[PDB]
């Protein structure tokens, strides 16, 4: 191991734990995200609360708030489109992720 | 020789979608951009089939659709999976219109 | 490999590719002729959306609108010499080509 | 792959438990311990969450239960379990309040 390698290796990992720093910062954005989604735009039977008491994981809380607001906002035929299916119980991902996001172009919109 | 069958259907298939869109296209976007005139231009099968695409996209999916279900809001680089998404968007857009 | 065996095989593989673009402007108009006949001389029932619904494959969809178009265009007497048999249920094929390319004159000489 | 899964698991856990301490502490403390200015001033994020945790042991939890439950009065160096009783208590105490 000479010099080169061992700045190389330090600088590597310190990327490594700033990336993974801004993975945490992405994640509670989303995490945000969601909560004000379902604060805003839906009911109150879906809220993380009571979905925990009914045990559900926190990803299958954010994946059910995410096609309800899917549903709500973004019509069958646009859902027919974009996830080639008319069904949402099996396209969360990230084509889930493009669904939610022309929900929130949808709500932009309508406001 | 089925495989040489079996690409004869691909191309089939391809196919549709090739004389599709070039079909609501000439009655959706313009006279400008037909096969013809862009073959005189210069642009290969593919690169008229994607630029259509492209443009019926920008005419029927709106600018934050853009920017939002392809993160991007220059559908210049988008091409793929997100652009038949894009393009089946526009499709229902016009069947909604 | 000399250069001579290098120049032959990369203009044998762009006339290759070349011959594959020119399938593909075939096929397409191939495929915008059936579109077409299937919009002006055949009912709503044959569409590709319903078939599809129904579970065809793309293939059989054009056989079937071009068996259609045979029956409904050519006559049953020009259909028995040409094909050789009443049924176009197993008449697919380059006959079939040679059955539509008839029904297309007999639409041209009725129009 | 299912060992990385866990570890982000626990990385949803903490970034919950940092939105949620930062949304409470904009409404209670202050704009000046703001995220983005103690960022700007050259503070880590651990190093943000601890001292926002730390100023809202001092405003909710009082003087005498930081130098007896903690055993020091000043709440500089005590961070760890006695931190987490102690932003509970903060906790309790604004959930009465």
């Known amino acids: 191991l000479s010099i080169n ?3 190389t290796k330090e600088l590597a990992e310190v990327e490594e734990r700033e990336r993974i720093e801004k993975q945490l910062l992405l994640e509670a954005e989303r995490i945000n995200e969601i909560d004000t989604l ?3 735009h839906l009911s109150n039977h879906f809220n993380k609360e009571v ?3 009914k045990g559900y ?3 299958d809380i ?3 708030q995410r096609r ?3 549903r709500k906002f973004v019509p069958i035929e646009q ?3 974009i996830a080639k299916v008319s069904d949402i119980s099996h396209i969360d991902g990230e084509i889930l992720e493009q669904l939610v996001s022309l929900a929130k172009v949808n709500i932009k ?3």
Chains 1, 3 share one sequence.
Do not use: D, P, S, W
Request: aromatic residues 0%; positive net charge.
């Open 109 to 111: 919109l309508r406001k």
């Open 68 to 70: 309800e607001l899917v």
């Open 5 to 7: 390698e061992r700045i």
């Open 79 to 81: 859902i027919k489109a």
């Open 57 to 59: 994981t926190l990803k």
């Open 38 to 40: 379902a604060k805003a």
């Open 51 to 53: 979905l925990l008491a």
């Open 62 to 64: 954010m994946q059910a």
